[PDB]
Design a protein around this ligand. Structure first.
Ligand code: A1CH6
Ligand code: A1CH6
Ligand code: A1CH6
Ligand code: A1CH6
Ligand code: A1CH6
Ligand code: A1CH6
Lengths: 203, 204, 204, 205, 209, 214
């Protein structure tokens, strides 16, 4: 990673072992749950492309999703080569034809060229694709059970939505696919009600 | 976040991995108990508005409450935009939706300082309080002492429940009104205007 | 807290997650055993009043003891308003943290002459916590007596443990008085005025 | 390791206990999976040859793999002596058998820097690549999708095995071949020059 | 504790939350096992007497041993008040109650330690605490070095493990060597005598295996 | 131990709690496997003779092994006295005194004396010299705790060649604490894998021998 010294000078700090193990464990547990994308963005704060490639390589398993991310990176890197015809190229930003010297030289410059933050965008885009492919249920099938507390139903509704679109139609659909015991109370509250009101009434 | 450099300067650091994992595991265990409101504000020390979003996004599950927090933030930002007509920040800039980290750091380091990180944290704590209310099913009214329960355990449930609902003398009269008659009479034995130390020591 | 800057100064730092989690685990384990008091002191080293309120809000359960601590604080604070009448001078609610900003709290702690509103607030909290240690220990030193075969070490351990919550030569008289008659005679064979080492070595 | 002081001056520091324990627990758990190479390279950032030997020694078990690594180290060291004769370090110096920590630090901090830490790590990673191919239970040519295996679960085993062999366009040509006849037909139907995204979307059933 | 500033000045710091829980968990486990002394001296590295009191007050249970430690402190402090009588631009002569932290402030404790003629009121107090802790290790010792005999099947290594384990809690010598050979089970004891004198523990554990 | 200050100065630091607990857990679990030796040297990186004794003392159990290390230290110490006799006469001004074996072992030396020796220029690394003696004794302890010998490591009926070479070099790792190890490795292979190794030929890499039997 690249952090600033006590002398206010951007230097290349080594990737911390706590961040390495944290990222591997996140994938081992959450396994592409929507919160893995923010956890990757935060654990890769100011990371050179070499560091991003190291974090992705330590991912144990899920190799199918990794090739899909690799293809997404390849597509985005080529698009960078078109919109921007020394200048960094898509291969330099992805860490394939760039040295750590070149990556640091691009990041610690005035004006800077954040080859690490650009690469993190490409990674987050492909990772967002992986969360949609991994979403087991569609929002059209999230329907409140007979004895399911309304909080638990909304817990599944907005998680499924956070993975699919990784909209007032969600408001109509949430009531439309709700238990009748609660659906009557939801119509009682009337249109345009705070989610706090809906869940307070169906308690 | 924006911390204190050795030279007294306000420099921007990365969010700690330990602080990330701590916040995630706190929701996994305490699960919107009242004890999460101080834990969030303590792990969000000097946080930029962007750093606050990152923390709330790493929350695993409970995605119902998180939408409730979104709507709370959207309501508080509209009151900010109303009470500040038309570079001073607006509510979208405070919540980090239409602001960059450069802009957020700018407002936080200016003299005079506009603490957009602390103003956003204020709204978040509001929505988090409304969440703790909801995760408290039993109202303060239904907390009554069973005759086979000590008075210490009854006041425990009374003030733990009120802790969520509050986010007063009538609350103390409800503490006496909802006691088992074995100790309730001993509460009227002490009379009004007494310390909880005496109110618990006597019935013990 | 307010730690010493490595430039020889005094700068405000954020409350460590390790410090918070250590305090939460102490209450979840020892649960107001007397050893909880010195652990709170060490974990609140140079803490601002705001940092102290955060350590108390994170306490899981025991809310009956917490409201008691609030009343103790509201007592010690009204006391400061009395015998201290009148950067602005700190009042009782300023030291407690209910009407003082973190900047004002830092101002008093880093002033010269320094107004230690952090250590003052810590004294008020420690007193009420001592009331909790005494209340959570209904067993008195008078009822502590040695059983038939209970080793002398097992009886002395319970003796000074109960005495530690209640907080002296009267403890030495009560220690021998409440021993079982088999060892009590051996202690008299040692003679009056004996060390605890000798009193336990004899009754081995 | 040779870190950078907060005053900018590169300085030597002791190996972190967490860095050591992490490396041991990596081999205790992943045990020479393909992801063991990048974890070693990350935890050995800026390490000295002495520090590299300490990491490889704390490995409990897998001694056959470790001796195989040792022989790979000697082979690469014999080449370094021929291609780069010391009129200057030699192979044993970079390996850490005839050099001191002061000599290593001197090479790693010099106007003309001889990075014996990264050179030794290069040889170690090569031998560690051999261990991953050896511990690889199956070849990429023996991975075939079952009639009841979802196309995703088969692609997972495919690229997991491929990361072991390859320490490549022919990998995509083999993926379609070793599939169940149902999804295999749909893949040829999607047309060559497709994305794994589309190849999996078309076989969700 | 009194640590070194990055500049190089002796400055005071808070007791580490990690060092605190380290000491409490050592008592909860080893429970005055012989290795409790070294852990205390290490965790109290450069600690003020106030910090030394904090460590000794956070121990869970064992309150009887604590009063015995307090008595051992009072004895060593009174002897300090004897060997160094208080005489009435430097620091005042510390009395034993100051070294223990009963009648001294943190500023005074730091003043003695951070002074050109250093008065280490932390290391002297730590010597008193170590002396009283060694007493507690003897009391918690269940068996004596004279009652440690090799069981008929018990291997020699297992016997020598218990021998020096108990001796480490007692002493806190060639007669211990003879006591080791002589308390062994008879077959091995004859082998030890068959080795003769001038035997390293490596040799007498190698032959009797 | 002795660390390197931000201002570029060899200063003294307190032994780390995490470093201590890690060393205790290593002995509690691995318990004198040959990988405990490098873990000790790394955890005792630049440690004073005082810190070295603090680590060895906190070892719970194995007190018989610890006494064997103690006696091995005394042997190396008297040897240090033989080749480095302490000379009489008052210590030259500005120079450190001459250390003896008990000084290096920490029995008759203060922390400031150890610090002055290590941070001097020329530096006398009493910590590293003591560590050498400690490692030499720990090496004997690994040889004693070695269950079997390298000459008795013999491959089972269907035991794969890899599982046999693991036990082979593991045991040799304790004994050493050579081309004859090649003959000793081939000789003990079960008759199945034994023939395949002989068919390969001499001067064959371990990768070749293992890939062959497979
Ligand atoms: N265009 C490219 O080639 C390319 C190259 C790298 C690059 C460079 C240096 C070092 N590391 C890498 C990447 C980083 C990475 C990326 C990603 F999107 C997902 C990941 F997990 C890891 N990692 C590998 O290349 C390892 N790897 N190897 C294989 C193989 F098929 F060969 F077995 C497979 C991977 C796998 F993980 F990427 C996919 C399972 C399939 C960066 C971006 C690029 F665009
Ligand atoms: N007005 C807005 O939109 C809005 C946008 C952000 C913003 C910007 C950039 C990056 N992150 C965010 C937020 C941060 C956040 C806030 C919060 F209060 C609770 C949280 F947990 C997380 N996070 C998401 O927007 C993700 N998200 N997405 C969905 C959806 F339903 F769409 F799937 C759901 C979330 C969910 F987590 F917030 C709630 C489950 C429902 C800030 C404040 C705003 F006002
Ligand atoms: N006079 C006051 O109010 C008062 C306010 C604070 C203050 C200010 C800012 C932030 N935090 C606080 C306190 C800190 C605290 C103190 C204490 F002694 C024990 C504790 F545990 C926590 N904590 C709360 O205010 C939360 N709180 N809320 C309720 C309620 F009844 F409302 F539900 C209950 C608490 C509860 F925990 F303190 C008691 C269960 C009852 C300081 C001192 C004061 F004098
Ligand atoms: N030219 C050499 O010999 C040589 C020497 C070292 C060297 C120097 C100082 C300190 N450490 C070492 C190595 C480091 C190491 C390397 C490696 F590739 C795998 C590892 F795990 C460890 N470690 C040992 O030598 C210990 N060791 N000992 C034996 C024995 F057979 F003797 F028991 C066995 C080992 C074993 F681990 F290497 C193999 C099981 C067989 C460096 C590179 C060289 F080229
Ligand atoms: N001569 C003294 O007075 C004296 C005073 C302290 C002192 C000062 C400030 C703060 N703390 C202390 C001591 C520190 C301590 C010492 C020790 F050796 C063992 C320990 F564990 C703790 N500890 C207490 O004061 C608490 N304490 N209280 C009682 C009581 F019986 F009164 F309830 C009991 C203790 C108990 F733990 F020490 C013994 C069980 C009995 C230092 C040394 C002195 F010489
Ligand atoms: N020549 C010496 O005496 C001698 C003294 C120390 C010394 C000095 C100060 C502080 N610590 C020590 C040593 C350090 C140590 C060494 C070692 F090799 C193994 C270890 F684990 C620990 N440790 C003890 O003295 C504790 N100790 N005590 C006994 C007893 F027998 F008395 F019970 C036993 C030990 C035991 F652990 F060393 C052996 C079980 C037997 C240094 C080197 C020397 F040469």
């Amino acid at each position: 990673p690249i952090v600033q010294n006590l002398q206010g000078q951007m230097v290349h700090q080594c990737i911390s072992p706590r961040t390495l193990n944290a990222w591997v464990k996140v994938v081992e547990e959450k396994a592409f749950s929507p919160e893995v994308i923010p956890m990757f963005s935060a654990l890769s704060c100011g990371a050179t492309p070499q560091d991003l490639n190291t974090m992705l390589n330590t991912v144990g398993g899920h190799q199918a999703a990794m090739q899909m991310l690799k293809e997404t990176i390849n597509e985005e890197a080529a698009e960078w080569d078109r919109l921007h015809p020394r200048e960094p190229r898509g291969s330099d930003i992805a860490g394939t034809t760039s040295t750590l010297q070149e990556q640091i030289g691009w990041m610690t410059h005035n004006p800077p060229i954040p080859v690490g933050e650009i690469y993190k965008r490409w990674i987050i885009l492909g990772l967002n694709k992986i969360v949609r492919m991994y979403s087991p249920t569609s929002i059209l099938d999230i329907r409140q059970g007979p004895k399911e507390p309304f909080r638990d139903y909304v817990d599944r509704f907005y998680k499924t939505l956070r993975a699919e679109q990784a909209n007032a139609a969600t408001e109509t659909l949430l009531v439309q696919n709700a238990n009748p015991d609660c659906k009557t109370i939801l119509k009682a509250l009337g249109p345009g009600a705070t989610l706090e009101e809906m869940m307070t009434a169906c308690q």
